[PDB]
Amino acid sequence: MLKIIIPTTMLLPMTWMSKHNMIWINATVHSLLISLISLSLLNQLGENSLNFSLTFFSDSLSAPLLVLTTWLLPLMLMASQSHLSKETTTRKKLYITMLILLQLFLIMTFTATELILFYILFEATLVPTLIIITRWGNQTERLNAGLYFLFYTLAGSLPLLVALVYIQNTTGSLNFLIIHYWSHPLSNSWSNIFMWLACIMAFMVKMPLYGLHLWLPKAHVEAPIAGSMVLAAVLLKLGGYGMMRITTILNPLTNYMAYPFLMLSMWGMIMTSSICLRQTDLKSLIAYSSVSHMALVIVAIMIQTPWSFMGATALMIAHGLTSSMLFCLANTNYERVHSRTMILARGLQTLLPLMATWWLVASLTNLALPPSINLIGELFIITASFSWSNITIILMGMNMMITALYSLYMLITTQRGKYTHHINNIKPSFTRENALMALHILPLLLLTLNPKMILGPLY
Amino acid sequence: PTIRLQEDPDPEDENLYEKNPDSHGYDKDPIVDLWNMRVVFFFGFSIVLVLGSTFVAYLPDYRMQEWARREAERLVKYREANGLPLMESNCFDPNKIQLPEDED
Amino acid sequence: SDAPPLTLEAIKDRVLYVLKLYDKIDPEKLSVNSHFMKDLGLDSLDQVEIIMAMEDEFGFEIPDIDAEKLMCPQEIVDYIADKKDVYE
């Protein structure tokens, strides 16, 4: 699959050899071309994966994620060139280099056949993200956010490494195919319980799980717009992909080791949906929305059924697109008024009608309106949970109401009412921002047209 | 000095519409701006979006859905014609399965 | 279409019409600039009743803080004109 990896490593020197005023054009054009190339991975089989070599393979679960990453890179490039206009040429090239390196690490992570290689790449993704957050963030909290982003990850991932090597000294292989075929049940002992915890906690903290999520609001609020985009749409799905991969060796311990995490996921989904109802920061509201959706995904992965896995895959794809769109929509208003408070700029539908339409579509998709893929994933997960236990329909149902409320709340706070009188610097929407919104929203409904592409291997 | 340090003042933000009434929001230079818009629109909507959707819509059936339907039709026809049950509770022949000798 | 574009002359005519149907004022003695307490000898209750009659006639409410200040028919006409964006 080097036909995708090599063009990114070629994006690197092309950016570093570009003329000072042509970096954005070249980067965007060739990133779009790389996305078009990566579109060919959607042609999957029904029985096994695409085993390209001893190192890399593609599956029906990782191909949509790869397509989403390669599609997200150009969107980040367009969203970044506004607030980086005054930067020097060298620092702009460094920023683009960080973005390209992040894409390369994510591409190699989603296709690694080996669990230690997966760990190495899934840990290497931290350095570009941390550098971006702590160098190009705007306020003084960013430094603290970086620390919160770093150690929260590492404290979860360092035990996993130990567990991984332990497994390789017992079974002799960490290759995913051999691991799947030579799978054996896990007994009920304290050592197996702690091995389960070591294998699970890293991906549960990257989701993030409720109670372990405190890093996410900081990281997604103090980051630049591209950083928030990549953190919310792709980097949160590393936990889901890793859990879906690693759960093949944890049965039947999961059958009873999932209870605390299931309880945390459901109650914290309710809790974060409620938190969204009282939020003075517009970016924090989107961050907590991400927390709630990822709690739903955690439940789906933890109950371990084919319908749950299908719904979880669809929900990850839909959430990535939707949250990236919401972050960009909030960043437009921030760039206009230089403040993140939701009740500062009001009645924006009067001043920006097409932006109000984009806001309406994003909010309608966030609350899982049929037949959007958000709804497909949510409904599949809810049906699987109902099969798991009939009482869950209470909590899930509760969430379905609360989400809608806060979603429309945001819209009604930002677009309706009367405009603030003293704010007179609201210029007409640029073609770049409208194109960004359209390129976010059109793929969502296009995938709604053909939903089996994002339903995962269990389809 | 009653001050703490020597620093530049915070400058006011620049409006791209002042020097370019039709500015597209891409760059301060009108030509580079216009061509950034053109390449974004051509390679995002014309090339990737429409052609990619056409390519995905016409992907060959490697999931073997139609083949599975035809196989099921064959098997249903045969088992209904000869009176055998449509499905068996055992997916493996018991003759190749060796149960343990003693259950007590 | 909708209601015609109310003018200053129409507003003045309507206000004087309403005032000339009040039993406590003499129609001959009443003028556009006649004061309610000074020239006409009314008290505050009569002024409140006059404001309520104007509210009924034009179909919109005048706040008490603003209604306390209108003392002559010209002031009432001016307040109505500024409220309804009438310039001719």
Place this chain on the structure above:
Amino acid sequence: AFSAPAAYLTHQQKVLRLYKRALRHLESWCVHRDKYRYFACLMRARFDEHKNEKDMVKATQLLRQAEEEFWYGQHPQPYIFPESPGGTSYERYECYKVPEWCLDDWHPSEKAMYPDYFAKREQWKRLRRESWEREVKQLQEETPPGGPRTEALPPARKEGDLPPLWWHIVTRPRERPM
């Protein structure tokens, strides 16, 4: 809405407000015109019975009983004028009110239409720009040294002055903008 409020309401002001509220709610109770006129005359007599009380304490005590009686006997669903803060059309047209500064961002193709309107707009903007320094100086002169004590603003007194802080009052969007 146009007048600057005071630090407090006087006794006479409170009595007048209670009189108006009682009349309106009684009218809401008495739908027909003749019945309303009858009971409004009765209410007027009831009000002017105690008009000549020299004891302020007893006057405010009578007002207290009046407010209690009004709150007990108020109409639960009083008539509200459609554009009043409780009416069915209170803020119906606020979505059509667009601030004037938005016109500063129109494309030159849009400004190619309506040339004379934009010429008049330029004249108004120039007048505001010339006027601003004087408006600030007048407010500086007329302000007591311990800051303003009310929200009232002075008029223009000089030969060709303009009343200070006039731009956003004069250029209100409209009552029926679109």
Place this chain on the structure above:
Amino acid sequence: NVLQIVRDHWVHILVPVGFVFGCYLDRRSDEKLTAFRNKSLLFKRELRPNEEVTWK
């Protein structure tokens, strides 16, 4: 005149050339995993009178 054009827009061939190089390297990787070519029980087949290998 093409000297300035080339020295300005020669960075536009790095990514396509990387794409072709990646395709070639994928083929080179494929040629090293032929230990079971035409040897699986499901696809074992007799060769045609002319062809040499079932797949490349």
Place this chain on the structure above:
Amino acid sequence: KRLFIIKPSGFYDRRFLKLMRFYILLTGIPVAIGITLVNVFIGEAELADIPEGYVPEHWEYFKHPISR
């Protein structure tokens, strides 16, 4: 009588919508015409049995010409 109606700048939203429509149609009208022409003049393959001694190519196992 006619008055001036104050609106925000509608030039830029209209321009963006026109540009998006233009590019989408620019690449999609040829695609639709080509799909229609292929469908009309080169129909779908007809299901048939494999003759004895014949080993079909892989793309021969699909029915639509574009998929093939």
